[PDB]
Design an enzyme around this catalytic site. Structure first.
Site, PDB file in Angstrom:
ATOM      1  CD  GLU A 136       3.705 -22.679  30.499  1.00 56.82           C
ATOM      2  OE1 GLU A 136       4.234 -21.821  29.705  1.00 56.82           O
ATOM      3  OE2 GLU A 136       4.140 -23.844  30.700  1.00 56.82           O
ATOM      4  N   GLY A 150       5.423   8.418  -7.386  1.00 59.01           N
ATOM      5  CA  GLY A 150       4.595   7.394  -6.781  1.00 59.01           C
ATOM      6  C   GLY A 150       4.433   6.138  -7.651  1.00 59.01           C
ATOM      7  CG  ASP A 208      13.181 -28.097  22.168  1.00 57.61           C
ATOM      8  OD1 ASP A 208      13.728 -27.936  21.023  1.00 57.61           O
ATOM      9  OD2 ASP A 208      12.145 -28.789  22.370  1.00 57.61           O
ATOM     10  CG  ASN A 231       8.508  15.984 -21.909  1.00 58.57           C
ATOM     11  OD1 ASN A 231       9.438  15.198 -22.040  1.00 58.57           O
ATOM     12  ND2 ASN A 231       8.283  16.946 -22.780  1.00 58.57           N
ATOM     13  CB  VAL A 267      -2.577  12.093   1.516  1.00 64.13           C
ATOM     14  CG1 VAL A 267      -2.828  13.559   1.122  1.00 64.13           C
ATOM     15  CG2 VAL A 267      -3.869  11.431   1.980  1.00 64.13           C
ATOM     16  NE  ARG A 271      16.531 -27.376  34.434  1.00 63.65           N
ATOM     17  CZ  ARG A 271      16.289 -28.388  33.597  1.00 63.65           C
ATOM     18  NH1 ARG A 271      17.218 -28.877  32.783  1.00 63.65           N
ATOM     19  NH2 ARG A 271      15.098 -28.937  33.600  1.00 63.65           N
ATOM     20  CB  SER A 272      17.456 -27.301  29.871  1.00 61.97           C
ATOM     21  OG  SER A 272      17.329 -28.265  28.856  1.00 61.97           O
ATOM     22  CB  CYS A 313      13.358 -25.165  31.254  1.00 63.65           C
ATOM     23  SG  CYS A 313      13.333 -26.925  30.874  1.00 63.65           S
ATOM     24  N   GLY A 354       0.830  -1.221   0.000  1.00 67.63           N
ATOM     25  CA  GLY A 354       0.000   0.000   0.000  1.00 67.63           C
ATOM     26  C   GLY A 354       0.851   1.252   0.000  1.00 67.63           C
TER      27      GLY A 354
END
Ligand SMILES: NC(=O)C1=CN([C@@H]2O[C@H](COP(=O)(O)OP(=O)(O)OC[C@H]3O[C@@H](n4cnc5c(N)ncnc54)[C@H](OP(=O)(O)O)[C@@H]3O)[C@@H](O)[C@H]2O)C=CC1
Ligand SMILES: NC(=O)C1=CN([C@@H]2O[C@H](COP(=O)(O)OP(=O)(O)OC[C@H]3O[C@@H](n4cnc5c(N)ncnc54)[C@H](OP(=O)(O)O)[C@@H]3O)[C@@H](O)[C@H]2O)C=CC1
Ligand SMILES: CN(Cc1cnc2nc(N)nc(N)c2n1)c1ccc(C(=O)N[C@@H](CCC(=O)O)C(=O)O)cc1
Ligand SMILES: CN(Cc1cnc2nc(N)nc(N)c2n1)c1ccc(C(=O)N[C@@H](CCC(=O)O)C(=O)O)cc1
Ligand SMILES: CN(Cc1cnc2nc(N)nc(N)c2n1)c1ccc(C(=O)N[C@@H](CCC(=O)O)C(=O)O)cc1
Ligand SMILES: O=c1ccn([C@H]2C[C@H](O)[C@@H](COP(=O)(O)O)O2)c(=O)[nH]1
Ligand SMILES: O=c1ccn([C@H]2C[C@H](O)[C@@H](COP(=O)(O)O)O2)c(=O)[nH]1
Lengths: 547, 546
Positions: A321, A156, A452, A134, A45, A449-450, A429, A39
């Site tokens: 959680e 533009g 994944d 032109n 504008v 500490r751990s 963890c 866009g």
């Protein structure tokens, strides 16, 4: 080497694109690609009115000249045109409609040679210090006769379209404005064979939207100080151990980028580092990992919400959680009944008995995060007990310290209760959060500490970032940095192929997180007090690609 | 255009210097400086006999050429010599003794134009692959005639002596061999105001010594690069406390190009906090500059990271470590050994200010030693017998390293939330996590509050020493100590002293030797610990206050 016109005259495009109201209707199963950002304009504008940071970027790029580099450019252009032998300026070229929507205060654009394309208007129709052309041919002629550094096509949509189709753009400086506005004009679909992304910036917030800056490049189709460097690298390796087992020709996109400044690259580079230099190891799980030890990631929560974009994450689970932590719950059934299965495998009869928790009810996860946050040191009984005013409510204590003793170096929330570890389905963890307050702003370090990296870390960045906002809000502060420290950082061997796919994806500008601002107490949040806006993301990845 | 012959002809010295036996001489409170490293030779051979990493470096530096970079260096040498006239190679200039010192296996030095200074001998005692010269002027000649990249003066003592004396040396590539040998010849004293250090490498171990590589310089008297500028468009005019700290006060720090010595991990964090730190007040009215979240990593396999930019003492911190391992909370045990680290935290006034009105003076409460051996036990007093009360996490992490080295739960935690209010001070050192790969032990320590000027230097040493101890009793080699800093602060009263410190160039690190017979974590004593080859700058009183 039949030199290209855009290469001799250094013709670049610079633009800003937002997302478009929706010609597909609704956002349930929303597909995203480069063309999500297209866009340009509405009713003559900008679709967004004002973007102060994009305008600063626009001004700095189109104004910047390096005088010491001009000589090489003048020579190059002279040769091309067959030719011999006071402040250097860039050229900016714009369509007539674009010229007319620049406020009067700002025209002509300061410190730049302004060039306007028009048929309806001629020099006599302008008061201002501008060149009127032109047709496009008249630009090449003009650039042959001017002293200038670079030439920027600034719009533009009609002007962009004709410079791209004529193959006259060397690079596109492309701003991704990560919000949706009503638009009646669009940047042309960029052909992925003609142009490749070579750089991605940091993510920022300006005028209540996130944005980033990317660069597209046209596809092909003293001296003894550099010797000292070489000398100080005499003792380096010819090879990385898993480099010959993970072939970096599988990272063509990831390695094709020159500037990788998007904060998602903190996560993606750690994956890269573990894949190339990681240690082959066994683990508790039997799955096997590549591992490394000790990393630090920083995310600026004032500027964005760092939800990974290179795959689809859903936050309902981890927001539920987190609310479950804050209530002090250990009852795995509460999450299961909201259809959050994060803890399901860790609450089973079999998992509990393999932990020697023979006297533990199914889904009673024992004295994990929630219990430690609200009741550290109390004797855990069962998940139904009311531990009323038992043990240390360290959550309430850290909120108190942040409000009343903000310079304390003792604002820590610790889940690692050494006494309680064998009673927990799983030892934590996320060991600890420490807080830092400066000038009305809250930062948070979480030590993991751990880690994944395929599955856990993406959710964990989001949890503790959300948690920093919640704590900042109830303490009357602004969120600043979330800082994530990785101890044992590992990629499970079963994630490698899917993480390889993910690493060749280019991040999208991050989303934003809004909290209901009436919530004054950490206990008073519910799931509908949380909104993720403008999440743009690549397709969901199954980490485990088994069937 | 003012040009000197050493710059015209790119004449560099390269050397390796050890420290020198003082055969019944000085050694009180030893003063060190660059001249500490001056041992070149003994009985016409190297003082240290063999050093494979120094020889690997010598071969790489003296063998390396950029052909692309030559055009500009041919141009420059022709302009000078009033003239304008297969594969490119450097020159190596040695004295005859040095030539004879080289084993025939390796002479002439592979892929180099070999040159030998000799009054005695002439081409007919050697060959035409090598060149002889009769005086030093005869080399300026022969350089003028040849296609050579750079010219390397490779000793010996007499060659370097006259080449320096006459001022024909642009740069000195100086290996610091951080051990003591018998020497009968020396490199010359290098004058401060004539040569300055511009680069300092990483520290290494080779042939049972640490070494590093430093570079001295002679003192005087295309488009993707724009994309970089564009990405920096939102940056500041300056760094916050720049006006306040004044980076001209860091001339030596800022003058260095390559700062690869691992001591720079510590010094760069001090520089970062001084330039960009947030001004705050603390538990007192004392000023700090503070930042949040840093990592340092030290390769314990290559060095012992005892800061070198000032003098550090370890007897206190080793005793504190043994005291932790015994499970002790009795501060008098340390005061009776004149270890006064915890004295201020044990006083009547300090304990009363903590609300510990019922605590005996120097009864520090359930701090580290109690949590390490007895986590979860009810603390009574510092004299109680706690045997088999609480979790012995020290024993547990050692058994984990031995039985389950790939466990991701090898963690020693002193932050007992239940006990914090009973402690003289809540622990600054929250936890250690360990990591085992291929017979090697790494350790992360997370520190919530880091006094960078005074505390952090000792804390690097404590936890590096603990890593070595845990490794040895588990039959592992130490790999990395990784220090994570939470609230990292410089006290305002340390700034002048840290400004001096940032301008000092690190020395090669020492080594730590443990008595190798200790195979239980509880059986170490103070005599089990030896710091070897500690070379350090003058002590700095962090608080200059008289
Ligand atoms: N977000 C961004 O990066 C940018 C946004 N915009 C927005 O885009 C809109 C303007 O775009 P758009 O309507 O496409 O108009 P343009 O700015 O592209 O102007 C179109 C006009 O330019 C002249 N023109 C263009 N090409 C030529 C040519 N080859 N020879 C001669 N004259 C030529 C003609 O003017 P004439 O009719 O007088 O002959 C034509 O009518 C506005 O909404 C503006 O705010 C503007 C630029 C950048
Ligand atoms: N650690 C290190 O960096 C290095 C170690 N070494 C050690 O240093 C020792 C060798 O150094 P050192 O004994 O001083 O010997 P050098 O190698 O410096 O040799 C000196 C000899 O070179 C010749 N010579 C010197 N100056 C001139 C001159 N101006 N014109 C003509 N001939 C000249 C003479 O040989 P002649 O009598 O034949 O005319 C002179 O006796 C050994 O022990 C060696 O192992 C050596 C080099 C580097
Ligand atoms: C053509 N146009 C539309 C517009 C708006 N944002 C853009 N942003 C980008 N990145 N690229 C563009 N081409 C772009 N174009 C313009 C261009 C300049 C100004 C303008 O007033 N510019 C002043 C900025 C003044 C200010 O806000 O401080 C300048 O000096 O550059 C307005 C609209
Ligand atoms: C925070 N957390 C806990 C977590 C994370 N990683 C782990 N990794 C391992 N190996 N073991 C764990 N117990 C573990 N636990 C989470 C969070 C989200 C999801 C989750 O929703 N995963 C997607 C995975 C989607 C996919 O890859 O297809 C799912 O649909 O279940 C799992 C665990
Ligand atoms: C002059 N000399 C003494 C010596 C030894 N070590 C040094 N080390 C340094 N850093 N600088 C010196 N000038 C230096 N000089 C030398 C030089 C080269 C060899 C030598 O045998 N080098 C062979 C290879 C030796 C190897 O690889 O072990 C080469 O190809 O350079 C021995 C003694
Ligand atoms: O929020 C969480 C919870 C778990 N893990 C990962 C780390 C390990 O892969 C595994 C925990 O197993 P241990 O480290 O305790 O063996 O789950 C995470 O990454 N994030
Ligand atoms: O081993 C130690 C002990 C203390 N400190 C510093 C950190 C703080 O400056 C102060 C501890 O006080 P609080 O941060 O808890 O207020 O001592 C260290 O750097 N290392």
């Amino acid at each position: 080497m039949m030199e290209q016109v855009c290469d001799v005259f250094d013709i670049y495009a610079i633009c800003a694109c937002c997302k478009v109201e929706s010609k597909n209707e609704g956002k349930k199963n929303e597909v995203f690609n480069n063309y999500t950002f297209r866009g340009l304009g509405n009713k003559g504008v900008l679709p967004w009115k004002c973007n102060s940071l994009d305008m600063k970027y626009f001004c700095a790029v189109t104004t910047y000249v390096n005088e010491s580099k001009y000589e090489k450019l003048k020579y190059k252009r002279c040769k091309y045109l067959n030719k011999e032998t006071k402040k250097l300026q860039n050229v900016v070229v714009m369509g007539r409609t674009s010229w007319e929507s620049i406020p009067k205060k700002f025209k002509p654009l300061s410190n730049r040679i302004n060039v306007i394309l028009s048929r309806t208007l001629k020099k006599e129709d302008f008061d201002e210090d501008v060149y009127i052309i032109n047709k496009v041919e008249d630009l090449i002629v003009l650039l042959g006769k001017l002293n200038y550094y670079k030439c920027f096509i600034i719009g533009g949509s009609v002007v962009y379209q004709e410079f791209l189709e004529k193959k006259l753009i060397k690079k596109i400086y492309f701003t991704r404005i990560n919000s949706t506005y009503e638009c009646d004009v669009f940047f042309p679909e960029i052909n992925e064979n003609e142009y490749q992304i070579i750089s991605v910036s940091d993510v920022y917030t300006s005028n209540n939207t996130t944005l980033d800056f990317i660069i597209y490049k046209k596809t092909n189709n003293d001296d003894e100080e550099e010797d000292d460097f070489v000398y100080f690298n005499f003792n380096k390796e010819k090879e990385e151990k898993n480099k010959n087992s993970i072939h970096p020709n599988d990272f063509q996109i990831y390695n094709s980028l020159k500037y990788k400044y998007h904060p998602e690259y903190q996560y993606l580079n750690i994956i890269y580092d573990i894949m190339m230099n990681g240690n082959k190891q066994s683990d508790r799980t039997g799955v096997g990992v590549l591992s490394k030890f000790g990393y630090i990631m920083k995310f600026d929560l004032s500027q964005y919400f760092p939800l990974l974009t290179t795959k689809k994450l859903f936050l309902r689970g981890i927001i539920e959680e987190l609310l479950w932590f804050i209530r002090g719950e250990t009852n795995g059934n509460t999450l299961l009944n909201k259809n959050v299965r994060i803890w399901e495998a860790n609450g089973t009869r079999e998992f509990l008995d393999n932990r020697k928790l023979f006297h533990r009810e199914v889904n009673d996860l024992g004295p994990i995060y929630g219990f430690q946050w609200r009741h550290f040191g109390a004797e855990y009984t069962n998940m139904y007990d009311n531990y009323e005013n038992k043990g240390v409510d360290q959550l309430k204590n850290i909120i108190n310290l942040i409000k009343n003793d903000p310079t304390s170096r003792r604002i820590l929330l610790c889940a690692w209760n050494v006494k309680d570890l064998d009673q927990m389905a799983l030892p934590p963890c996320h060991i600890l959060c420490q807080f830092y307050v400066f000038d009305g702003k809250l930062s948070c370090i979480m030590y993991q500490r751990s880690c994944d990296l395929g599955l856990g870390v993406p959710f964990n960045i989001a949890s503790y970032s959300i948690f920093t906002h919640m704590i900042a809000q109830v303490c009357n502060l602004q969120p600043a940095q979330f800082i994530h420290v990785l101890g044992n950082a590992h990629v499970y061997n079963n994630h490698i192929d899917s993480l390889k796919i993910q690493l060749n994806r280019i991040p999208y500008p991050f989303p934003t997180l809004k909290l209901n601002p009436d919530i004054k107490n950490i206990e008073d949040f519910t799931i509908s007090d949380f909104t993720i806006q403008n999440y743009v993301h690549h397709e969901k990845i199954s980490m485990d690609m088994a069937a």
